[PDB]
Structure formats: structure tokens, C-alpha cells
Design a protein around this nucleic acid. Structure first.
Ligand SMILES: [Mg+2]
Ligand SMILES: [Mg+2]
Ligand SMILES: [Mg+2]
Ligand SMILES: [Mg+2]
Ligand SMILES: [Mg+2]
Ligand SMILES: [Mg+2]
Ligand SMILES: [Mg+2]
Ligand SMILES: [Mg+2]
Ligand SMILES: [Mg+2]
Ligand SMILES: [Mg+2]
Ligand SMILES: [Mg+2]
Ligand SMILES: [Mg+2]
Ligand code: NA
Ligand code: NA
Lengths: 136, 76, 116, 50, 236, 66, 177
RNA sequence: CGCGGGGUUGAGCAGCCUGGUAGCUCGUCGGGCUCAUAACCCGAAGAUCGUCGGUCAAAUCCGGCCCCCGCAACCA
RNA sequence: GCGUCGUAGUCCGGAUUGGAGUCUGCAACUCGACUCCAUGAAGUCGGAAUCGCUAGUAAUCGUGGAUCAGAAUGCCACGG
RNA sequence: UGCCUGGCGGCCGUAGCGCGGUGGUCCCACCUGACCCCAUGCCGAACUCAGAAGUGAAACGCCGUAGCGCCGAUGGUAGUGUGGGGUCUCCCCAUGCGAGAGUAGGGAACUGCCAGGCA
RNA sequence: UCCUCCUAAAGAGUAACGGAGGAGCACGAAGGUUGGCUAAUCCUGGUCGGACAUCAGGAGGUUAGUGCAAUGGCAUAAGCCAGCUUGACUGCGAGCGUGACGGCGCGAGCAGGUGCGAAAGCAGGUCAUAGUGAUCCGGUGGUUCUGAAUGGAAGGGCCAUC
């Protein structure tokens, strides 16, 4: 489920999520989906959104997923007192800072690409926008 | 819960800094490897500790073909 | 290589002597000549220099580059050194094995007024 | 642990001995070394003992 | 190796040391698949026979004729051929993790373990060994040639009852030929099929059978003589 | 050389059927006579007589002596 | 030796006109012969290695140096410090002597011999070949040999190219295809 | 899942015991005896020792994965 | 009767395979017999069990015939 | 004074790799021989000794060139000490410090004690 | 109870039933000097021999190794190979580091003898950091220090050690 195989450590600290993003430019295709807000994306949501874009185009153009969770989030069981160790790993998440480009496509006309991403933006917690590749 | 053990801190680091007047035999750095190599007028113990060999001033230098830090004592 | 594997063979002794800060008498042997000089604890400026390429010392020797030549140089460097106020030195192997015409060189210097 | 304590008695006849640990299994041969004897003030040979 | 009909016959053998004759005009032929017990007094040539069989000596007369299929493996009469400054495993194998017995190899550790030398008792130096353990180890080291004409010279040196019976039951199953020299006739009573009896003047006589059948031979051609002891004593 | 840890080296001589008497430096001490040698060397012969495989129609045509 | 003077007199003069170097000593020279017998089977018993060592001592007038395993590998059930091969090195005049007697009285003795493959060059003028039987050397009389284990011979030359090294072994009348 | 135990020929079991050495009884297959079958006699075959893996050396140690079998869930 | 081999997988064994062939036959590929040269394998007396034979018999040796263009280690007979 | 060479340093890639050309009067390596002290877990390959005919072939040293390695601004950005403010799991304003990466661009080292050729 | 890393906020220290691993040893050589040497991996050629054993030469440049976890180190090697060896010495110790204390650690140099080296020099254990247990009571060696009227002795004391 778009999840790392054979990591180095099973459990990780909570950390923080300040700062900005680095992969802010369209690099593989011509259209991309930025990330206006700051949050985090589950592995379930990445696949749920990808299935939404694919069913829109349904034959044409590559899709790149520039983001990858590789961070384990743990949960304590139901009706369990505090302490007694750290919780067990449940799902994997990908922290998102503003500007990060999540998905991006190629070979699709603009109008179809515009609505393909919108059907995916409805599945993601964070506010997202549309960006076109620039020569720079 | 399986883990939960640790060792007492060994209190390493630099004990006298640059421009500090030392007496003979005083410890300059407590070391694990050799991050600081023994320059002139300093020694090197079995614990890789760098002790002064003459009273003076501590001077850190970066002499060497591999840019390895050296500590030497100016005679004053 | 000859020189590449020899300079690394003499680095340890050359650095330890530098730490002690003593004047060292270094020998450089060649299949045709041999050299010996004394260099201050500075490591840069020299005091006494004798070699077989020098014309006067090599005139009296049949073939410069044997045991006989080196002892003539080994005695010769001692001659100059004692006239420069120098008595105590530390012989430096410089990589060459202390067996042949370097043993001959230093031994004559040892018997000609150098205390090492 | 298989190393057991042994003592190196002296050989000058005085009462003086060092102590050490020796593998009596893989080294059945007895030890003898040259150590300092501070009673007679000399380097004498120290033989193995109980 | 498989062995055929010729089992090193011996013809007109005569041995002497100066003038002291041990054996004169001896001739026999060991059959195939047999065990031959040798009996006689002390210093009557029993070890000398194995010596000349194994090529160490030469016969003053006659010739011993080996079979070409015969593999030789002779056990020395004395344990004093090991080096006391070596471990058991090293002494037997030769410092090899895998050695070979006969033709197939199998690991050295297992080969020694087959002689009841467990992994712990593996580590003792052969100088630190009881008499029976030393005998067992020497036998184990020498029996690795994988031969088939086993010339045992008193394997019952320092063997307990159970140690003795283990080899006593293992020998009866031997395919090859076994020549055994011993003094305790009770051990041979269970394994011997041919008999070599020594006598006076250097007389060696062959016989086919066990000791009860030897007694039967004596009783069939008997002689009245039982006055063995005289009790010389020591002090006047 | 390190001396006295080697078999003895000499200049022994052997002889072949085509003469071939050469004082070859070898460690034997009692020479062994030899078969054909470099003067009968099968380097101009062996490959030239190798080629005998292939060609059987001419083998059959001889049977048509009828 | 014999072929040393041959190299001094004929080979260099021929090669100067052949490949046309501007200096005499730019001509390739063959400098060492290394003979190795990799037993491997000596894992079971040591005596085999000593027999192979005596064999090489017979072929070349030197005591072989036995070589142990460089790496512990489980594929062949060996580990470091296990004597696994034997080796001999020949330099100078006594190298020339063995090299001469090789092409004199051992190559023709090869069973069903036709020649030596010419494309057996590692790209820098170094040659090697296995014999598969020690009996090509006349110092074995089927009296002490238990097996017919062979040997590998290597010839190391200063030829910077295999084309340069061609007319090195060719000039000595080697049996090439 | 909080705690323990187990996994070996087709079936049931040893051998884990401190590593160098895979066995047992039944059963499968082929002959024999018998009019024929059972019984009986003779001769064979086969097991990645659950799995991922990490001690010269393991079935044997250790960690994990899988499945199964028990035990405890008390005071209010 | 005179020789050799001296107990070995052999001067035992004669399978299998490669060449050369002779015949009968309209025709020897699937599928004949015989000859020559080379090759020279299992096999060192056989588990459970089981068969024949009471005198010219058992055991061993050779010859013959029927069938048939050719094709017997089988069958039917004969003697030592 | 100038050019060239050997030894000992200074500082450690702006100094090291790659490719092209090039040197043997002296210096330098290869080379010649090795019974001699010396050496080879075999070997004059290495270490070592006795020499001089050829050699500048490989290395070494010189120059030459931007395929590399390497160095690298200005501006901006991230961050952060102190004081305030917000919709406050994050930020903004005043002030002080201010990177890393990347762009331009720089880049075939500089140097002091001796001895030895030469002119 | 002890050792290594992170949490730990660029000196030191810093908690939780926070996240991950080890120790209760070994070595008379695996210690001391004096000489010498330098790895993993890949390619080409080569007798059995292959994906991988030994040999040769090229790329390679520490991805190697450390007596055993991890971190910091290591080419002058602290890694690898031999000779002779016992400094794995006795009495001290300027001066420092770290502890609430008990204690623990580093140490040039001095004296007496010692090994290695031609010497200059190095050596008071092991590349370092775990491999541990106070006091009381008792055991075994040395020492007339003491010895309950005196001379001895028992028993104490001091040094070494269990
Ligand atoms: Mg057979
Ligand atoms: Mg037979
Ligand atoms: Mg008829
Ligand atoms: Mg017919
Ligand atoms: Mg801090
Ligand atoms: Mg800190
Ligand atoms: Mg060590
Ligand atoms: Mg050293
Ligand atoms: Mg060391
Ligand atoms: Mg350590
Ligand atoms: Mg009293
Ligand atoms: Mg007392
Ligand atoms: Na006897
Ligand atoms: Na006893």
C-alpha cells in the first residue's frame, strides 16, 4: 500500500512539521497538483486519490506520485491505560509542507487534466491548487 | 517492555580551551578516539587523553596533510 | 615503487625525531653516490653537508658508491660538524636498511667525534 | 570463567610471590618468567606454584 | 579394499638374532576372512613376526608372499609413539577438519567421536590421558588407514571389561583378516579362529580352530605333564 | 638461493632416437632415454595428419565397381 | 643456458626490424615463470599436497611454496589457513633453462599433440597453459606417483600489447596454430 | 494477547539436552508361502526436522513470521 | 601325451558397441544368419522359498531330423 | 645572477587525476654480475653488495591544453538572540546576527636551507 | 548492577513501565620492542575447477580488518607477517578530570634493576570505553612491631593473598 519495505527502525518520534517544501516545481510532466496547506497524508489517501485521477483519464498519460509516506504512525489499543510502552505501528504518513507537488501528469489536454486533479483534490485533507510547468 | 537501560555519562569533551594558561600535567581533552592528535608539548594517555607536558598556552591547530586537528602548547 | 614505498617506511622515525626536537643526520644512498647532511630542529635550514658528488672528496676514491666511499663521506661529515659547534646528533635511517654502506657511513662518524 | 588464580612463587628462597590467572586446561605446562624480587632487589626467575 | 584368495602365505621362514633362533622352518597360509590368535611365552618372537610381515625386518630363510589385494595396517606394541604436547583431536586427525577413513572422508570430529571421545573430552592433551584412554586414542589414530589385514599387537593393553567387550564384539564383524597377538586367552576364546602356538627350540605350530578344539586336539593326542610350579622365592 | 633445501641441479644429458644429445640442466642424476623429440616434433605433423574426417561419397563410389 | 643467448642475439635484432622501436630496450622481455598446482583435494589428507610438492620439486629445481586459502568460502568447504595449492617461481638464467627444456622435451611428449592456442593472451602479452599430466616431464617413472594430476604454466612478459607479445613467443619457435 | 507449550517420514512418537552420528512401531511398494485372501517370511523406498533469517559446526542457539494447544481476566 | 598360465575380475567371462564383410532372397532400415578386426560390461556360487532324479538312471559331451529360400539356446531322437 | 637536478622542509587538490609533447654532459632509474656479510615461510621480484657498455622504453621531472576532481562570490532564501502581535499543533512586525545549495566566475600551484651540471 | 547509541535543545549534566543493542570474559601470547608488509570487490587468461578455492596482470582505493554490542578512532597504521623476549617490574609521584561521600580515572618525572634496538628511543599489559561486590568474620605465606611478674609461647598488629 505504497509503503516502505525493510526499513531500518520500526518506530519513530512524533517530530514537528514546520518549514516549507523543496519539490515545488513541475519536473516530469506538464501539469501538477501543489499543496497550499500544511498537514499530512496517509497511505490510504494517496491510493484513494490516485484511483480517482486514473478513472478520469482512464487510458492516457503517465502519472507521477512525487510523495511517499515512509513514516510510521502508531496507536495504542482501545481501553488501555497510559504508559506501558509505545504503541504499535498502524499506518504510514507523508508530512506535507506548503508548496510540495503531490501528483503530476503528462500527455493530457488541459481541460481534462484540470478536472482530473479536482476529483482527486476532494479526497485529500489539505487545500490543493493547480500548477503548470514553467521553463524558468 | 524489553528495553529501558542505559549507561552512566562518561563526561568527555574539551576541558581547557584556547588561550588558557595551564600547569604541567593538566588534562586538556578527555577523548574516545583521537579526534585531537598530540602536538608538541602535549602527551597522549592510554585512554587517549591529551595532557599538558609544560605550562603555557593551549593552541589548537589544523596542521597536516589530512587536515587533522592538533593541540600544542605555546611556551610562555 | 622504490621511493614511494621507502618514504612511507621512514615517516614514523622521521616524525618521532621531529617531536623530540633533535638535530638529525640524514643519509641518502644511491647506486652511484651517497649523501649525508645535518639539519636543524627547524627542519628547514641545514648546517653541514657532505656528498660523493662533491669533487674533492670523490677525487681520492676509485669508484664512488661502495663501502669505502661512504666511510670517507661518513668521516667527512663528522669533520665539518665538530667545527660548527655540533657534537650531539641522532642518526636517521631514512628508509634504507642499516646493514651496508650506511652502517659504514655512520660508524666512521661515530668514531670521528659524534656522540650517538 | 575457566581461568583460575595461580601464584608465581619466587626462586631466591624468600617469601615473595606474584599472582595471576592461568588456563589450567589448555596450558598444562607450568609457567616460569623473570620478575623483580623487591626483597633481594634483583631480577630472578619466578616459578609456578599453587 | 576387497581381498582375494592370497592372504600372505609364508614359506620356510627362519629367524635368528646372532645365534638365538626364534623361529625355524615355518610354513603356513592364512585363509580368507579369518582371525588368528598368537600365543606363547615372553620374548618368543611374536612381535618379530609382525615386524617381518610389515616389512621392517627380513627373513633369514624362506619368503613371506603377500597377496596383491592385501592392505596392511599393523598396530605397534607400544603406546610410546604419540607426542604428549598435542591435543587428542589434533593428534588423531592431523589438524584437518575433514580427514578420510578408507575411501569415504567423513568429518574428523565425528570420526573421533565414534571412539567415545566427546567434544569436551576432545581438548585434553594426549600426555594428560589415562592408560585406557591412551590405548583407545592410539588405536583410533592407527586404525584410520582403512586396511584389511589388521595386525593387532595386544590391543587389550589397559582395557576395562566393557571397553574390551566393545572391541571384542566389533572384531567378530570384520570383513578383512585379523591377526591378533595377546596373552589373555579369555579374550581370544571368543574371537580366535586360527591358533599360532609357540613352543621351545623355536618351534611354531599352526592350528585351525578355537581353543576348545585345540584342547580337543591335545586330549586326542595327549601327554601326561603337569608339574609347572616350583616357587623359587627371593631371600635365603 | 637458500641452499640445502632443494633437490640437486645438474647438466645431465639424455639421448633420443634421432640423436638429440643435449646437456639439459635437470634434476635426475641418472638419465632416462627418450622417444621422439624436437627434431621429430609433431608440430608440423600432428595437425597435418589430423585432417582425415569428412568425405564419404568417394568411399561409396568405389563400391560402384560394377 | 641456451635460449638466453638466443634471445640476446637473434630475437632482439629481428624484432627491431619487425616492430621498429626507436630504442633497443623497448623490445618486450619475458621475465618470470610461475608454476602452480592447485590441489584442493588435500583438504581430506595432507600427504597429497606433499606428493604434489615433491612433483613440482622434481619438475623445477626448487622447493615449492604452498599457498593457503585467501578467503573462507563455504561453497568449496574451505577456509583461510588451509594449504590448498603449491607454487614455484623461476627468474633469470635458471628460468631460461626450464623454459628451454619445456619446448625441447615436454611439448612434443603431449598426448595427441597438435599445437598451442594463440588466442590465450590476457591482452597484455602474458601466456598460460595447463598440461593435465605431469608425465610429459621425463622425471616420473610410475613408481612414486599416485595420480596423474597436472600443472599450470604462466609466462609473464613486459609486452604492453598482445600483438607485441605475439612475436615474443613466436620468435622462439613455439607450436602455435 | 497478557503469559506459557508445540510444529520431525504417509499416521503416532523419539532424538532439541547443550552441536559434529535421521531413528522407532504401523503403514506404501516388490517378491515368497496359499485354491484365493488375511496373517506370517524376505527385500526396498521416502523427511527443505513449520518458516524468514542470522554459530568451524544445529533438528538442537537466538530473534522474527505462520498456525495450533492451554492458562488468567481479582477487589469494588 | 607333451607345454604355458600360478589365483588375478586373470590368458576367466563374451554382453554391448564401431568398422570390414559372405550368403539366401524381388528385396536383410524398422527385422536374418554366419565370418574377421577392435571393444571386453554385469558376474568371485547367489534372501525368503523352491525343482528333478533309485542304474546305464542323475551329471556332462558331441551328432542327427522334422518345420524350412534363409532363419534353434526350443522340440523330437542317437550314441560316449 | 640565469636556467636544470638531488636531498630536507613550509602549507595540504586554485596544489590532485586525465590527455599531448619532451630529458640524459652532470644528476637520476631501469640495467651488468653476484661465490662475498646480507636476503627469499620458492624466486637477486624485494632487501644487499661489486660496477659500468646501452638505455631515456616504463617511472621521475618539466612545460601545454579546461574531460574531471577542486575553489567560489553579490543578491535572495531558510534559521535564530531580544521586544511586541496574531485566525496561535503555525506564523507576522522592530532590531541584531545570517547560512546550506545553486549562478557568474577562478582554476595546470606558490615558497626557504643547502649541495651539484652548465652558460 | 555495568557498557554503546538516540531522546539531550552545537561545553558538561539531564526523566518516563521512552526507541534500539550488549556484559558477569579471553590472552603467557592476542603483551614489549626491532625489522618487514598493506585490504573488500570486479574483469581478462589458465589442468581437473564451476557463480565462488590456487596462479598471472589490470581497474580499484579501505566498500577490508580489529578476540567478543555500538559509538569514536586507526596508513607513522591501533590491521597483517617473523626474531629475540617478560616493563602483564618494585617504591614514589609534580599536576589534573569526575563524584554528596565511599571511591574511580589520566599522569610527565625521580630511584633500583630489566628487555628490545647500531643508536635516538620505547616498554609500569591488550585501539579506548563493560567483563563486577564495601565492612565484619575466618584461612595461608613473610615480619621477634607487640608479648599482662621475667624469659618463651598463644593471640594480636603490618605486608602479600584467598
Ligand atoms: Mg564387479
Ligand atoms: Mg578367484
Ligand atoms: Mg534337414
Ligand atoms: Mg532351415
Ligand atoms: Mg546544551
Ligand atoms: Mg551535550
Ligand atoms: Mg592486540
Ligand atoms: Mg613497526
Ligand atoms: Mg601491537
Ligand atoms: Mg577491545
Ligand atoms: Mg610474659
Ligand atoms: Mg601474625
Ligand atoms: Na613383543
Ligand atoms: Na593409569
Amino acid at each position: 500500500m505504497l509503503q516502505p519495505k525493510r526499513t531500518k527502525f520500526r518506530k519513530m518520534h512524533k517530530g514537528r512539521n514546520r518549514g516549507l517544501a523543496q519539490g515545488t516545481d513541475v519536473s516530469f510532466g506538464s501539469f501538477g497538483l501543489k499543496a497550499v496547506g500544511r498537514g499530512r497524508l496517509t497511505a490510504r489517501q494517496i491510493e484513494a486519490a490516485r484511483r480517482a485521477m486514473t478513472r478520469a483519464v482512464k487510458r492516457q498519460g503517465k502519472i507521477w506520485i512525487r510523495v511517499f509516506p515512509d513514516k510510521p504512525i502508531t496507536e495504542k489499543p482501545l481501553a488501555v491505560r497510559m504508559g506501558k510502552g509505545k504503541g504499535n505501528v498502524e499506518y504510514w504518513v507523508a508530512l506535507i509542507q506548503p508548496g510540495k507537488v503531490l501528483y503530476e501528469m503528462d500527455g493530457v489536454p488541459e481541460e481534462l487534466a484540470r478536472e482530473a486533479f479536482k476529483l482527486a483534490a476532494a479526497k485529500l485533507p489539505i487545500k490543493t491548487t493547480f500548477v503548470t510547468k514553467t521553463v524558468m | 517492555t524489553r528495553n529501558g537501560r542505559d549507561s552512566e555519562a562518561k563526561r568527555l569533551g574539551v576541558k581547557r580551551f584556547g588561550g588558557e594558561s595551564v600547569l604541567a600535567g593538566s588534562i586538556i581533552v578527555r577523548q574516545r578516539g583521537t579526534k585531537f592528535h598530540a602536538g608538541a608539548n602535549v602527551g597522549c594517555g592510554r585512554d587517549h587523553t591529551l595532557f599538558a607536558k609544560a605550562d603555557g598556552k593551549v593552541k589548537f591547530e589544523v596542521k597536516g596533510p589530512k587536515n587533522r586537528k592538533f593541540i600544542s602548547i605555546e611556551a610562555e | 615503487d622504490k621511493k614511494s614505498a621507502r618514504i612511507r617506511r621512514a615517516t614514523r622515525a622521521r616524525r618521532k625525531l621531529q617531536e623530540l626536537g633533535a638535530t638529525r643526520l640524514v643519509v641518502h644512498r644511491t647506486p652511484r653516490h651517497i649523501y649525508a647532511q645535518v639539519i636543524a630542529p627547524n627542519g628547514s635550514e641545514v648546517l653541514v653537508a657532505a656528498s660523493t658528488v662533491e669533487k674533492a672528496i670523490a677525487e681520492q676514491l676509485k669508484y664512488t658508491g661502495n663501502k669505502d666511499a661512504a666511510a670517507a663521506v661518513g668521516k667527512a661529515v663528522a669533520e665539518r660538524a665538530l667545527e660548527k659547534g655540533i657534537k650531539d646528533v641522532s642518526f636517521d635511517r631514512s628508509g634504507f636498511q642499516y646493514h651496508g654502506r650506511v652502517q659504514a657511513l655512520a660508524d666512521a662518524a661515530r668514531e670521528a667525534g659524534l656522540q650517538f | 570463567g575457566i581461568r583460575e588464580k595461580i601464584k608465581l612463587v619466587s626462586s631466591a628462597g624468600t617469601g615473595h610471590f606474584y599472582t595471576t590467572t592461568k588456563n589450567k586446561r589448555t596450558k598444562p605446562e607450568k609457567l616460569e618468567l623473570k620478575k623483580f624480587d623487591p626483597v633481594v632487589r634483583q631480577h630472578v626467575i619466578y616459578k609456578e606454584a599453587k | 579394499p576387497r581381498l582375494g584368495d592370497k592372504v600372505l602365505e609364508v614359506s620356510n621362514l627362519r629367524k635368528s638374532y646372532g645365534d638365538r633362533l626364534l623361529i625355524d622352518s615355518l610354513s603356513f597360509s592364512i585363509p580368507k576372512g579369518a582371525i588368528v590368535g598368537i600365543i606363547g611365552p615372553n620374548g618368543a618372537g611374536k612381535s618379530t613376526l609382525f615386524r617381518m610381515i610389515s616389512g621392517q625386518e627380513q627373513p633369514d630363510s624362506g619368503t613371506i608372499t603377500l597377496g596383491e589385494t592385501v592392505k596392511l595396517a599393523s598396530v605397534d606394541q607400544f603406546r610410546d609413539s604419540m607426542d604428549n604436547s598435542k591435543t587428542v583431536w589434533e593428534e588423531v586427525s592431523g589438524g584437518l577438519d575433514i580427514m578420510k577413513i578408507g575411501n569415504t572422508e567423513m568429518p574428523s570430529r565425528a570420526y573421533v567421536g565414534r571412539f567415545n571421545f566427546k567434544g569436551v573430552d576432545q581438548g585434553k592433551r594426549v600426555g594428560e590421558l589415562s592408560g585406557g584412554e591412551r590405548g583407545r586414542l592410539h588405536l583410533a589414530k592407527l586404525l584410520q588407514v582403512g586396511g584389511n589385514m589388521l595386525l593387532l599387537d595386544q590391543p587389550t593393553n589397559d582395557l576395562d571389561i566393557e571397553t574390551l567387550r566393545a572391541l571384542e564384539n566389533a572384531l567378530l564383524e570384520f570383513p578383512g583378516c585379523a591377526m591378533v597377538i595377546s596373552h589373555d586367552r579369555w579374550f581370544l576364546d571368543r574371537i580366535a579362529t586360527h591358533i599360532l602356538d609357540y613352543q621351545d627350540e623355536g618351534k611354531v605350530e599352526f592350528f585351525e580352530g578355537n581353543f576348545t578344539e585345540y584342547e580337543e586336539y591335545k586330549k586326542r593326542t595327549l601327554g601326561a605333564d603337569a608339574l609347572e610350579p616350583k616357587r623359587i622365592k627371593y631371600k635365603r | 638461493m637458500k641452499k640445502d633445501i632443494h633437490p640437486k641441479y645438474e647438466e645431465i644429458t639424455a639421448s633420443c632416437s634421432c640423436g638429440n644429445v643435449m646437456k639439459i640442466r635437470s634434476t635426475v642424476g641418472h638419465d632416462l632415454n627418450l622417444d621422439v623429440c624436437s627434431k621429430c616434433h609433431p608440430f608440423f605433423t600432428g595437425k597435418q595428419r589430423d585432417v582425415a574426417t569428412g568425405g564419404r561419397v568417394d568411399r561409396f563410389n568405389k563400391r560402384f565397381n560394377i | 643456458a641456451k635460449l638466453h643467448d638466443y634471445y640476446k642475439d637473434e630475437v632482439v635484432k629481428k624484432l627491431m626490424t619487425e616492430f621498429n622501436y626507436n630504442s633497443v630496450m623497448q623490445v618486450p622481455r619475458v621475465e618470470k615463470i610461475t608454476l602452480n598446482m592447485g590441489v584442493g583435494e588435500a583438504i581430506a589428507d595432507k600427504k597429497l599436497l606433499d606428493n604434489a610438492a615433491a612433483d613440482l620439486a622434481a619438475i623445477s629445481g626448487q622447493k615449492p611454496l604452498i599457498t593457503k586459502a585467501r578467503k573462507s568460502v563455504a561453497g568449496f568447504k574451505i577456509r583461510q589457513g588451509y594449504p590448498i595449492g603449491c607454487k614455484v617461481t623461476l627468474r633469470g638464467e635458471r628460468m631460461w633453462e626450464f623454459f628451454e627444456r619445456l619446448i625441447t622435451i615436454a611439448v612434443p611428449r603431449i598426448r595427441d599433440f597438435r599445437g598451442l592456442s594463440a588466442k590465450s593472451f590476457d591482452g597484455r602479452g602474458n601466456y598460460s597453459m595447463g598440461v593435465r599430466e605431469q608425465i610429459i616431464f621425463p622425471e616420473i617413472d610410475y613408481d612414486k606417483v599416485d595420480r596423474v594430476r597436472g600443472l599450470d604454466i604462466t609466462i609473464t612478459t613486459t609486452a604492453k600489447s598482445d600483438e607485441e607479445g605475439r612475436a615474443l613467443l613466436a620468435a622462439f619457435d613455439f607450436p602455435f596454430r
